[PDB]
């Protein structure tokens, strides 16, 4: 529950940072 919720937020953060890496990659090639 709450203990699982903490690691759920922790993994939400790593998913977000992976998506932000993807956004950095797409911004690397604009037009």
């Amino acid at each position: 529950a709450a203990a699982a919720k903490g690691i759920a937020i922790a993994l939400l953060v790593i998913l977000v940072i992976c998506s932000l890496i993807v956004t950095s990659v797409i911004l690397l090639t604009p037009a």
């Binding site: 690691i7 993994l11 990659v25």
Partner: protein, 460 residues
């Protein structure tokens, strides 16, 4: 045979039949202990109930326990009556076997106890006289599969690491490992969905002059994630090539091949009308959700369990389609619109109405069209709904099996914990005996002998 030993005198008379046609010495009887049947009823007891029966009946069948000589151990000379420690009601059927020559099986008694009693008296299980066999073998198979599910023997360097990765719930680790993949496959498939909406990625608002082609970057990232996950799985396989052929593994490998093949095609010779097939396979990433929800696995087990009658569904559907189309086309080949141009053009009608779907793109016009169209609709209801329950009931049964397996796994673990607790209690009792109703004393004495023979002492 020995099963009808009560009818020797019959054959004795039969012997007199072939006396005048005989030519020999007539080797005479081999004599006997007694030419009578005064052998009295022998009181054989089972846990306090006396089952009197005649000796000749017992030695009618020799190889069983009650036959031959192995009953002497159970003999009780100081009161002159056989004693057995077994179950009375169970033993009654074994008693009946000697009287008749074929056992039975009670509708309502535990198969484990009955089978162990049956084997105890040394008589083969399949003596059943095909009157209760249909039920005994049914219950025996049910118990056998119950204990097979009792034998799931699930376990816990990298040999345990990859299993823990496969473990659905390791709290902090496996939950992250699954959630990342679930989110990423979800965003991949939703990207494939949205890469088609006009404003998203297509010439929807650029004709005047956003069409942001970044879905290629997202697809590349996602498929990189898939391929690294599958490389981890390939290093995680106990048998590298042997476990590739698995269903989930082949779904994974076909969930990654289209991207690589597309890249190889891009720098290869371009073939017109071929990239559409490649883009179609982009949707198969959604199949990876099998590991997400067990319902997909239950459905796969259903479709590959009742895979016999699905062939019948397909074959009978083809029969009905052909039969009704070949009468539809000839029924109204000549008409105003004459939409039923040909039989392959009538397949669509006979399948849009066999399924009770109903569009109106093509409908019968002649009167002879109407009757057979309605007949087709009813036949479609029948054929379609015929193999439904064999699938949905099978699916529900398999789901109940998979719930029962978890329940019995939890119960088995609790029982094992109780066994460990009882063992610890035995050790505690021995220690208490050492510090300060005969079997416990003798057991403690034997452990004391172990203490001396191995010069080591026991402490809590």
């Amino acid at each position: 045979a020995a099963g009808v030993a009560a009818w020797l005198p019959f054959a004795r008379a039969a012997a007199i039949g072939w006396m005048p046609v005989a030519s020999g010495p007539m080797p005479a009887p081999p004599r006997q202990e007694r030419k009578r049947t005064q052998d009295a009823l022998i009181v054989l007891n089972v846990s306090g109930t006396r089952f009197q029966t005649w000796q000749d009946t017992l030695e009618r069948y020799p190889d069983t326990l009650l036959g031959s000589s192995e009953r002497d151990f159970f003999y009780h000379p100081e009161t002159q009556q056989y004693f057995f420690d077994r179950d009375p009601d169970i033993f009654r059927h074994i008693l009946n076997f000697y009287r008749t020559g074929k056992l039975h099986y009670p509708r309502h008694e535990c198969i484990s106890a009955y089978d162990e009693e049956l084997a105890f008296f040394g008589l083969i299980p399949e003596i059943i006289g095909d009157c209760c066999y249909e039920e005994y073998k049914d219950r025996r198979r049910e118990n056998a599969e119950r204990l097979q599910d009792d034998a799931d023997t699930d376990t816990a360097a990298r040999q345990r690491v990859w299993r823990a990765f496969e473990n659905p719930h390791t709290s902090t680790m496996a939950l992250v490992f699954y959630y990342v993949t679930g989110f990423f496959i979800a965003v991949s498939v939703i990207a494939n969905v949205v890469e088609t909406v006009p404003c998203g990625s297509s010439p929807g608002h650029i004709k005047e002059l956003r069409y942001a082609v970044a879905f290629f970057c997202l697809d590349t990232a996602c498929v990189m994630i898939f391929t690294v996950e599958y490389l981890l799985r390939l290093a995680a396989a106990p048998s590298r090539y042997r476990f590739v052929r698995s269903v989930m593994s082949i779904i994974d490998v076909v969930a990654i091949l289209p991207y690589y093949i597309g890249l190889v095609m891009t720098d290869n010779e371009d073939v017109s009308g071929a990239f559409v097939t490649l883009r179609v396979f982009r949707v198969f990433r959604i199949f990876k959700f099998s590991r997400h929800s067990q319902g997909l696995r239950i459905l796969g087990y259903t479709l590959k369990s009742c895979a016999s009658e699905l062939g019948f569904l397909l074959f009978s559907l083809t029969m009905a389609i052909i039969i009704f189309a070949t009468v539809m086309f000839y029924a109204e080949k000549g008409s105003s619109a004459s939409k039923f141009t040909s039989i392959p053009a009538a397949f669509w009608y006979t399948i849009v109405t066999m399924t009770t779907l109903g569009y109106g793109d093509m409908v019968p016009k002649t009167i002879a069209g109407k009757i057979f169209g309605s007949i087709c609709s009813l036949s479609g209801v029948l054929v379609i709904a015929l193999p439904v329950p064999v699938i949905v009931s099978n699916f529900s049964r398999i789901y109940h099996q998979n719930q029962r397996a978890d329940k019995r796994r939890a119960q088995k673990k609790a029982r094992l914990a109780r066994i460990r607790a009882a063992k610890s209690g035995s050790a505690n009792a021995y220690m208490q005996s050492k510090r300060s109703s005969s079997f416990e004393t003798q057991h403690h004495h034997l452990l004391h002998c172990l203490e001396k023979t191995t010069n080591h002492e026991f402490v809590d």
